[PDB]
């Protein structure tokens, strides 16, 4: 009775990749021929930030253009100060196998977590000064591999155990747990309304995950190998996901399918992390050969590179403004570009 | 100038100063990683050093030098993601069960695995072959020898430099000496000159355990100024 | 939190004292300390500072040579050494913590205080000294500054102090931008040069005088003060 059900399951799929084939009536490079390039964006280092002892592995940026927060795997998380090159703060971790960071919008409380299952929420502004645990959850079977923060009392983790769960931060128990992917999640976005979330793992695929209601609306399999970095587009329309095959391939929700794969001949390395200007015509994509690339999102053409890092880029966020980006590496120096 | 300004920079300055002062300690201490099946004796090692945690820790310390050994404790069977994060330590150590024939394939694939690994391609790979008594009981006991298993055992004999231990039968030392010599062929294929293995019989109860750690990671550490004196 | 004040007392000309104050509740090494003076029914004035870690120090030109600060972090205990004491030193001593980064709201904290008893740059000028005003009305208090205190990065180093009937100056604002611990109903705008405290509801709590004071530069001067009665 499991092989009946085995063969449902492949008529269903293959009715549902049928269904949206014929939906496929144009390819996005013959609409985007006609618009003018977007030329050589050259891009300058502005600020070097050092000071990190390890490896930089995440950063995130949050509602100021300004302040940022970087983590490494040394036990430290600093904020910095993009304007001024000051360090804000200093937080010495309990786990140094961090692997995560994130920036609340209401910029009071900054989270992390790694290899040690457990996800800290450190509070900024708390009253004493000095920086104190308010919850440390724990749960997760698995290391955490990105958290990202949807307000000052929720917040949204991934776990190396297949599973993903909302957590509430004044009570530290799981409101939500989703069905969880085939393999190891990897990455996070969260949507601009707030209201839903693509989560990528292991197994080159992605599913469109709701806040409120935990089940999975929407999946892709676009990609041939593990995906490192998703991000959603500007307009919560669509997303970008990089993966270790040295290709990045733009999904969209309204279409269900993949639009544009950014991809080079010359390019061997896989996408550590990806992210998306304001407009969204700048794709910037991190890859493991020491050097950043800028795609154009609609014509697919390399508009730049960033080959200020000696290392492997591990992280690489836009502000919010997108008056500058910052680019982490392994080589323990955080640069801000034009 | 600003006064805030000049207050933020001696704030600056001082998280300067207290992350120099961590960055001494960090470097100070070494870093070492323990890997190995749930049928290798790792957990009887880690407890013998009294010298949903998804990571376990422990500190010793030999000859006064301080060596933090780091075990997962709570993770998945895949280790192709997590394995990234323990790059730039000190050395690996790689615990199999060599008197268990099985389940000794699996354990060269894993080590295999971990040795043509792009990012761990600079770590050097400690390998110790716990569980060397109940190896010789069990190739004395003449009931199965790991012929059963690896063909290529028919037609190997024990080298002409092999120094065995007052007392130890020839089998137990042929059959120790082909497992190294599988592991040595298995590590020199693509070793790529810049990290090598360091083979060491020890058993549940030999106290030289971290004595041999010592001591490949000191020549560890010799290999990586060469590299430097050289500008390799 | 708590900065409770000691060495108080009666002291005679050409004297020394040694004004000691207890730190608790927080990092009193983060924390930057301010001694602030106020001569009996006056306002308030800047005496010295002491940075982090002992890195930086700075004193009031009217008291440089006489008074030194120091602090000993290993109890989280401030002293304030005063070497030939006049007449005029009559006054009542408070210590304010203060931590300097983007968002912080520095002088946030005001201890209780010590009584001590004997025997050219920027000036904050408050037009207004009273204001007469029963509940239900709005208060606005207005300030002039000679220097404009906006300085090239665009921050507005405004800081506004409420002192009550025996109890401490509590800061309301510290850069527009409301400080922690107070309502909503105060409010300041106004250019680098002039500034407004601007209160929609006045409740029996306002009762006290308003200190303005600058920022832009190290060595501060606290205004007259506007008091309001309810």
């Known amino acids: 009775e499991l092989d009946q059900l085995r063969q449902e399951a492949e008529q269903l799929k293959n009715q549902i990749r049928d269904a949206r084939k014929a939906c496929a009536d144009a390819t996005l490079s013959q609409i985007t021929n006609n618009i003018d390039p977007v030329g050589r964006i050259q891009m300058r280092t502005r600020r070097t930030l050092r000071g990190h002892l390890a490896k930089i592995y995440a950063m995130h940026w949050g509602t100021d253009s300004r302040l940022l927060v970087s983590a490494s795997q040394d036990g430290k998380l600093i904020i910095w100060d993009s304007y001024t090159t000051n360090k804000v703060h200093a937080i010495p971790l309990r786990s140094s196998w961090v692997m995560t960071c994130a920036y609340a919008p209401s910029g009071n409380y900054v989270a992390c977590g790694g290899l040690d299952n457990i996800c800290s929420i450190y509070n900024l502004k708390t009253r004493e000064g000095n920086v104190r645990v308010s919850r440390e959850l724990a749960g997760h079977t698995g290391y955490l591999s990105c958290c990202r923060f949807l307000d000052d009392n929720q917040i949204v983790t991934s776990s190396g155990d297949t599973t993903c769960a909302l957590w509430d931060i004044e009570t530290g128990q799981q409101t939500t747990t989703f069905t969880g992917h085939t393999g190891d999640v990897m990455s996070l976005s969260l949507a601009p309304d707030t209201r839903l979330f693509v989560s990528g793992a292991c197994d080159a695929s992605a599913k469109l995950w709701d806040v409120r209601e935990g089940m999975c609306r929407q999946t892709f399999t676009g990609h041939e190998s593990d995906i490192n970095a998703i991000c959603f587009f500007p307009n919560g329309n669509a997303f970008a996901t990089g993966s270790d095959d040295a290709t990045c391939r733009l999904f969209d929700l309204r279409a269900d399918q993949e639009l544009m794969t950014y991809s080079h001949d010359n390019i061997i390395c896989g996408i550590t992390s990806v992210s998306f200007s304001k407009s969204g015509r700048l794709l910037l994509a991190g890859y493991d050969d020491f050097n950043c690339n800028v795609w154009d999102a609609l014509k697919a053409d390399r508009a730049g590179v960033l080959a200020g890092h000696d290392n492997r880029v591990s992280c690489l966020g836009v502000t919010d403004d997108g008056m500058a980006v910052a680019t982490g590496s392994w080589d323990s120096f955080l640069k801000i570009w034009n | 100038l600003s006064a805030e300004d000049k207050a933020a920079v001696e704030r600056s300055k001082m998280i300067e100063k207290q992350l120099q002062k961590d960055k001494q300690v960090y470097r100070r201490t070494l870093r070492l990683l323990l890997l190995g099946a749930d049928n290798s004796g790792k957990s009887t090692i880690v407890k013998q050093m009294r010298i949903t945690s998804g990571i376990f820790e422990t500190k010793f310390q030999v000859d006064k030098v301080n060596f933090h050994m780091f075990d997962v404790g709570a993770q998945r069977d895949e280790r192709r993601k997590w394995i990234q994060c323990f790059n730039d330590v000190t050395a690996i150590i790689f615990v199999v069960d060599s008197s268990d024939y099985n389940r000794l394939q699996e354990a060269l694939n894993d080590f295999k695995s971990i040795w043509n690994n792009r990012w761990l391609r600079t770590i050097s790979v400690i390998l110790f072959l716990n569980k060397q008594d109940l190896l010789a009981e069990k190739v004395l006991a003449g009931k199965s020898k790991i012929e059963d298993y690896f063909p290529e055992f028919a037609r190997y004999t024990t080298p002409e430099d092999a120094t065995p231990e007052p007392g130890e039968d020839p089998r137990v030392t042929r059959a120790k000496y082909f497992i190294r010599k599988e592991f040595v062929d298995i590590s020199t294929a693509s070793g790529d000159g810049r990290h090598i293995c360091y083979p060491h019989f020890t058993c549940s109860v030999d106290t030289e355990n971290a004595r041999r750690i010592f001591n490949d990671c000191k020549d560890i550490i010799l290999q990586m100024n060469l590299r430097e004196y050289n500008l390799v | 939190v708590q900065l409770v004040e000691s060495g108080g007392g009666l002291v005679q000309p050409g004297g020394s004292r040694k004004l000691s104050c207890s730190a608790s509740?927080?990092?009193?090494?983060?924390?930057?300390m301010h001694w602030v003076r106020q001569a009996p029914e006056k306002g308030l004035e800047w005496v010295a500072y002491?940075?982090?870690?002992?890195?930086?120090?700075y004193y009031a030109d009217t008291v440089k040579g006489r008074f030194t600060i120091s602090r000993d972090d290993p109890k989280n205990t401030l002293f304030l050494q005063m070497t030939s004491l006049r007449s005029e030193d009559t006054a009542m001593y408070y210590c304010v913590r203060s931590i300097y980064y983007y968002g912080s709201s520095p002088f946030d904290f005001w201890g209780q205080g010590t009584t001590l008893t004997v025997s050219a740059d920027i000036v904050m000028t408050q037009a207004t000294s009273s204001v007469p005003v029963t509940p239900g009305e709005s208060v606005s208090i207005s300030c002039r500054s000679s220097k404009s205190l906006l300085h090239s990065n665009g921050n507005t180093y405004l800081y506004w102090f409420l002192q009550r009937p025996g109890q401490s100056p509590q800061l309301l604002i510290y850069?527009?931008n409301l400080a922690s611990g107070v309502p909503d109903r105060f409010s300041g705008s106004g250019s680098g040069t002039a500034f407004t405290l601007t209160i929609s509801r006045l409740e029996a709590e306002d009762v006290g005088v308003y200190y303005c004071?600058?920022?832009?530069?190290?060595?501060?001067?606290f205004g007259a003060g506007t008091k309001l009665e309810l």
């Open positions: 509740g927080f990092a009193f090494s983060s924390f930057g």
């Open positions: 002491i940075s982090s870690g002992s890195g930086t120090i």
């Open positions: 004071m600058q920022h832009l530069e190290y060595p501060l001067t």
């Open positions: 850069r527009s």
